[PDB]
């Protein structure tokens, strides 16, 4: 329904994310929404993210949204 965050360029494992890298586009699969765009920025991932790769929950190491499953590692 809404636009999800997808990596515009290709980044290796453990790479800091930036605003110009994360793109809020409405494409599948629906990974992480653009709610914590400025918050997730700076943190690195545990898996590799090629071009046009949506933000996945398993790819993020320490999730910033501490609601139910995501939160502290």
């Amino acid at each position: 329904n809404k636009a999800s965050v997808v990596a515009n360029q290709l980044i290796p494992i453990n790479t800091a994310l930036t605003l110009i890298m994360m793109k809020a586009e409405v494409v599948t699969p629906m990974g992480i929404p653009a709610e914590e765009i400025p918050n997730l920025v700076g943190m690195q991932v545990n898996r590799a993210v090629p071009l046009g790769t949506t933000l996945m929950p398993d790819m993020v190491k320490n999730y910033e949204d501490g609601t139910t499953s995501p939160g502290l590692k």
Side-chain angles (χ1 to χ4, degrees), residues 27-47:
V27 291
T28 50
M30 278 197 276
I32 306 200
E35 208 177 88
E36 285 214 87
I37 274 296
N39 237 303
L40 297 214
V41 131
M43 79 111 79
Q44 301 209 125
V45 298
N46 228 35
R47 298 199 177 263

Side-chain angles (χ1 to χ4, degrees), residues 11-54:
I11 54 130
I13 294 122
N14 276 301
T15 304
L17 304 167
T18 51
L19 275 151
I20 294 135
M21 265 192 224
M22 277 183 278
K23 258 212 173 187
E25 224 182 271
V26 181
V27 291
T28 50
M30 278 197 276
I32 306 200
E35 208 177 88
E36 285 214 87
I37 274 296
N39 237 303
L40 297 214
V41 131
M43 79 111 79
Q44 301 209 125
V45 298
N46 228 35
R47 298 199 177 263
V49 175
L51 278 121
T53 293
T54 188

Side-chain angles (χ1 to χ4, degrees), residues 32 45-47 55-63:
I32 306 200
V45 298
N46 228 35
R47 298 199 177 263
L55 225 180
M56 275 199 150
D58 290 274
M59 284 196 181
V60 177
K61 246 244 160 185
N62 56 288
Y63 239 108

